[model samples]
Target: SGKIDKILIVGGGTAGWMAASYLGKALQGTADITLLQAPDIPTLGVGEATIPNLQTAFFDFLGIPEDEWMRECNASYKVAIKFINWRTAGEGTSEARELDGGPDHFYHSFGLLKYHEQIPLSHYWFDRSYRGKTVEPFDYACYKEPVILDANRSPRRLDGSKVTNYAWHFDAHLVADFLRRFATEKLGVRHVEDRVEHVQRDANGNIESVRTATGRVFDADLFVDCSGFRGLLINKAMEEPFLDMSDHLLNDSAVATQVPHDDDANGVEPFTSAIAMKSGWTWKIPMLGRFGTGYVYSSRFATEDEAVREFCEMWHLDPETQPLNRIRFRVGRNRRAWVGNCVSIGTSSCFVEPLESTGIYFVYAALYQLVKHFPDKSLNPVLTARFNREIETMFDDTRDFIQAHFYFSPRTDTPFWRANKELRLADGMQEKIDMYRAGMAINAPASDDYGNFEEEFRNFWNNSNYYCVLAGLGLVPDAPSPRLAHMPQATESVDEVFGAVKDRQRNLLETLPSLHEFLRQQH
Candidate 1:
């Protein structure tokens, strides 16, 4: 039985190197790992935000120090996504503008809803929001992290605090460069800088060797395509068909620009902002001293120049003066991301909008499943099946949730959103909405059904996302389960939980440093 000896990773952007760093560390002093970075091709540095678990599972496992990583990547903490102007424009009629005629804000928290672990605070909050409406869901988010983010504050400073949760916003290319440095110097992974001129296929329908433009040939048992959208190995050489998801996703273009930091004014925010644009949406990420902003929209409604102008309008910048980076992409994935001995990771496999800042999460997920089922030269179909099964489930889960934002929006303000209504909810999504609308509990499904091992369970999005979506849509189904009768007086159990939430929130705000100040200190 021959073990998979060497692996060739093509392309050297965030995707390629992320896979490399993880693999390099995993195969430390064990197997051969080689990464080929094309000198001419520039990095597609979009999608800079990440979820929390990525930090715990991937980076920590590799023994990377957070203090250094943060400094190296020019990063800052992100506990939630603050959605500005995502609310509907009309109430009953199908008008194309906001009936409220103002900015409508929503919160998709990384923290729990109203209470702590006993139950989701969303149900309780939903019930309270309607009749004697004290506040909006964004403002009323009961959890500590969301509340802290709402106040523009950092998380609890003390260690061993389970109440705080956060991810980060960093430079994608810097992360790639960081991983490259770590992998080569410490992990014994070989880095080759060259362009692949031709991919040679063997009779067994697997990649035999890739010939570089500089007359160098690299052969490996396993080939990973980190080649971005070009799919140099997975698509170009193997002819794997690409599936375009534009019909379902809608927003296909992006105009990216850097917003300079104001030093003390609109200082770094603890959360990323996804503001609703005329046609699609715009994302803002706070790094060391600047904001990485991008407008992801549909060309069918707004021209590239128009989108750039409007994007610049937000920062009050002139298009003629500021440099804007324009990107065109198809929102889809290869039908079979894993073909024979070759697999695609990063943008090579799929391209979804950075709506929820899931760009790196998907990349992390792909590498994670691959490591779980470490393939050998035996070429067992089961290993391939397991990787495909788990990764596809993750992709589908993220795809549906992101699409919900567009499909359920009340904005008929533009042709893009009016066209968004055409994308219908899937049976599972519809069932979820129906269950919530009917006042039924949106409890998590049993994990045993997936037949995954204890650690293999992949949680797509937490219950907080569900609550935020439903809450953001202004749909009230069931009130909080008889869990809150103490404050009303709400139920003792829920009241206790709410008490804890307030206590924790107060303690956090008092104890933790300001978000902007924390980042400023770091930089």
Candidate 2:
């Protein structure tokens, strides 16, 4: 069997460059890597927000300077996502309840209030509630007496924990350019500026060489497809069938725009804002320099023009000053992400809506898996099958998680919400939802063999969060399960842990400088 020597990556946008940089970093001086970027193709003009795992990928693979990239990309810090106007079931009606000043504006922070910590608070609260002790959910009397603090403040020294996990909001184009420079300079990655005109296949129908419009034939033993939704090599040339997911997730169109930051504003919030609208939802991502906003809606319910108009009206911005760029996409995955000698990554392999900021995480995960099962020139069909199975599981898991958000929403105010209700859940989602409703702890035990399982799953979907949402949505069990009743009451433990965490967070907020100040110091 021949050994893999040359690797040619077609396209140089975020996905392409990300693949090239990772491959180059892994193979270094041992192999030849060439990235062919079409001069005519403009990069996607949008800001990219990612999960905390992106930081892991950067530190492990690229080794780029954090402070420099943060400044250059106009990045911002994000601790947790703040969902506004979504907790209420109804919207814009007499029955509609908004969390603006209501009892529902909740913070789904990264960590959980521990079991031991919750025990004391629950006992105290339970002891009081029985003796006519009633406290509003939003009442901060127990934790807010010392000081009132806003949650959006940045660069703050958070109390108690040395490990402060965060994500970033950066200019997508700038990040791609930064990686391009890093790959070319630090690593010996070759770059070719040309459009792929033709793809040649060998007798086995594997991609052998790709010809560019500039009359250059680049041949490689292996190829990675990162050509975004077009799927130049994997789907188009290799003829891989798509696994459509539109029936489950219907928001196929988006109108994105940017606005300058307000000088009077203190600084960027350490979270992304996903505001629910009539047709779909709007995302507000705060970057260092500006705010990246987008209205993602189903075209069947609302047109692009209507979405843009509503976004502008809500933001109180002039359409002429801040025009929206419309983007259309199909949500699905390729049947075989790894076909023959080529491996598809990023948008080429699959695309779930960017609800949880899992797009970049998918890229990182795919690259990590590819390196784990890297093949020689003669591709191993068995290994390729296993790789494709893992990729399928990855996309399926993402699909389930993203669809959970839509299905869990109780709003029936619009056609979009109703449509979401009609969409069927994946095979086991209903079972999981039922189990959660029955008061089984929604912990992803270490013994669970689910392919992308992690510690986050265990903590992120703890019992209280599940109970709150299920109860809030009116989906309750016949009776409180013995497990929940036997478990420590939440009210007392909430008080004790709340006191500890609140004190730490408050002190950090006061001592930390404004986000602008922190950026200035970095520069």
Candidate 3:
């Protein structure tokens, strides 16, 4: 097999620049890479929040200092996602009512349970509740994150050292530009600012070269399509089929805008807010200076204008004073993300709505796996197939997790909310839900009684993640697993343990500075 000598990457958003930077680093002078970025093409720069991997993997791998990039990107820390109005029943009006709640809202925060003991804290909580004892919510009982987030406390000490697991809420465009500079200036990647006018291919149906607007043609052995949703090279040129997922995950449109913090009245919240709306949901990601807000709704239920109006109403934003970007995006992955010599990354490959802030996660996951399966000129079909399969599972698993946000919600207030119940859950999702109804926790310990079953059914999300959503919605079984009786740990006083944990949480809360204060100090 011949090694790849020349590589061409089309488009230059987070996906393109990220691919360029990562490959430029990973390849280690193995191949020459050129990135063709179209002039005047605006990127959908609204993805402001990310999961933990961005900090642990990508940035760490690139050797980019946290403080350096944080300043450049106007970034802030995110500890959890607070979901509002999701657990409420019908409220009759568009206004979300906490009064109709089983449990109005919950936090799906970062980090694992703090209580390390026989089985897990979750099982003990459930067992205690089944035994008719008052119990704390899963989030509060398992970790201090809920208390930390609710108090708007930073997940860092006053000395600016990380105390807990966290991710970022950054300006998307800035992240792209930051990566672009690092890739081109620092990593020796050639950046060509020109639009792809034509894609030239050989009789073998492999992309040979791309002709830009300036009439310059450059050839490469491999083409990476980071052309956003355009799929310029992969879908348009290669003719690979896109497998639509709208039937299962209904959101396809969004109205995104950024708004300023008013007089610092409400200090910058440390977590992302996924507030439930009439049609869909709204995301409020707090960056250093402003809030990156967006309402993601299905067009069938609410038009773009309706979404904009609702979004404005929810946030008290003026249409004239504030600008909005209305986006209609595809909600699925390509049938084959890696086709011939062309591989689609980012929105060109797949997009599950921004519910969990998975937009950037999907992009990073794709590029990460692509490097894992880096191919030579042979473009081994086996490698391509494996890449496609792994990526597909990531998208599919994430889709199911995002779907759980709706499926497990008790809200049936609006037509949109009602219709959400009618939408299909992912394959095996129903069985997973059913498992929750039985005595066993969906994420019950499977391997060594103390070890988490991370490998039992893992993808982008694991069983523990699912348990968070399900448990958050008060979707727990009425009884406890029979094993709880024999396991002395489950029969022990949950209140005593919970009381001790809450005591420690309160101590941490008192010591930590406000997220706003911490951010101000950093700046």
Candidate 4:
């Protein structure tokens, strides 16, 4: 493939800047890079939350110092996410009984799922469980992450092997600022603040050039679209259609606002909260100075006015005084990400509900894949087809995983929930759920509980996630081993592995520095 000489990126925000940073780094000395920023186009700069992939894709890859990132973005550590009141509230006589009775609270922690030798961690834990040696099936997963939650300890490994997986919560806009600085200063990428008024294409449907609001036409062999919902290049110019996944993902609207710290809300939380609401769910992400909170709901289920009142009611802040921000979004992806010479990144590429904080993950994955398959004027079809497939797979898998939260929920209290309960999960979900119900654990080393998962999209949902979700749902009865009935088993080697895992967890709990304590330090 001939190397592309010049590349132009449209719309600068987190996506655009991230693309710029990545492209600049990957194509250093190989091509010239320029990023066009429209001052008027507002960025989705809500103080955002993220998952562990950020650790791998952003910080570690870029060699950005963690201490700097922490201080600059007001970042904090996130070890696990706790879900409260997502399941069926237990029946009882009074509100006290109904509300407090159902213990639906659970956490999908980040760490080694469980320890197993020949079989999987679930079985050894299962055997111990039936023998009154284990707390619950979900309790098996409550290992490393629990220590972080209970002790508020940050992750630490003397030899550099991670005990607890981690991510960060930061002001999204601040992060973009950080990346922007890195792009221009570190990567030598050119940044232009200009508005795009028009786009030009060759006879082959390739993007030949783009005209700016200043009547200047910038030419590039390749284009990256970070234009948010407008999808300026991939959709508007290329005529690529959107593939709506609203049927599986119901959230299309969000009411977001920042609440400053007060006496009642001071503790810096280690994880984001995706709280279930009447029509949808609310996210409470804690930063250093304030907590970033928002309500993501479906438009068909409730009106914006109704949601605003309820959101205010839920949080108890008079929006009439502080006010809240609400916006509409279509949940889906481009029919194709890479069309001809132009490729859509970020929102232009896909828009799954942000339940798991895969928003940035999508873009990072896209950029990573793009770098892997970087092209030139030739615009390789083989590379583009494979890249598009991978992008689509990531969206599909993540959507199903998010949908499983609502689809498997036992809650039938509200119309929104009732509708979610009626959802007929995406492909391969039913089989996975059935397998888990039959005591079949989502063991990773060698497993196919989710069908023959291809390598392309497998990055999103890992063994840790599978175990957490399956166990969190309360579908796996302790009585069963690997079938429908409560079957229990014990293997000699498996027990040894389990014992070793426990020992490591205990040692780390005592060894690691407190998550809060380390961040408090200047280092």
RMSD of each candidate relative to the true structure:
4.4, 4.8, 3.0, 4.4
Candidate 1 lDDT over residue span 345-406, tens digit each: 98888888999877887887788778888888988989988888877767777777888888
Model 3: pairs clashing at backbone N, Cα or C within 3 Å: none
Q: Which ten residues in a row have the lowest lDDT in candidate 1?
A: 445-454
Question: What digit string (tens of lDDT, one per residue) describes model 2 on residues 412-492?
Answer: 778888888899988766776777555444543333111232444223344444433343334444344443345555544
lDDT of 3 at 415: 86
- Candidates' lDDT values, in order? 0.75, 0.68, 0.79, 0.73
lDDT of 4 by residue, 149-254 (tens): 6566666443334566678888888888889999899988899989899999989998999999899899988999999899999999999999988788888998
Q: What TM-score does candidate 4 reach? A: 0.88
Give all TM-scores, in the order shown: 0.89, 0.85, 0.93, 0.88
Ranking by TM-score: 3, 1, 4, 2
Candidate 4 error regions (>4 Å): 41-45, 88-103, 126-142, 156-163, 262-265, 438-459, 477-514
Candidate 1 regions exceeding 4 Å error are 41-47, 88-103, 114-118, 130-141, 156-163, 441-457, 478-493
Candidate 2 segments exceeding 4 Å error: 40-45, 89-97, 100-105, 112-149, 158-163, 263-266, 443-481, 484-495, 505-512
Q: Considering lDDT, where higher is better, how would the candidates rank from best to worst?
A: 3, 1, 4, 2
Which consecutive 10 residues in model 4 have the weakest lDDT in total?
A: 90-99
lDDT of 2: 0.68
lDDT, model 1, position 86: 66
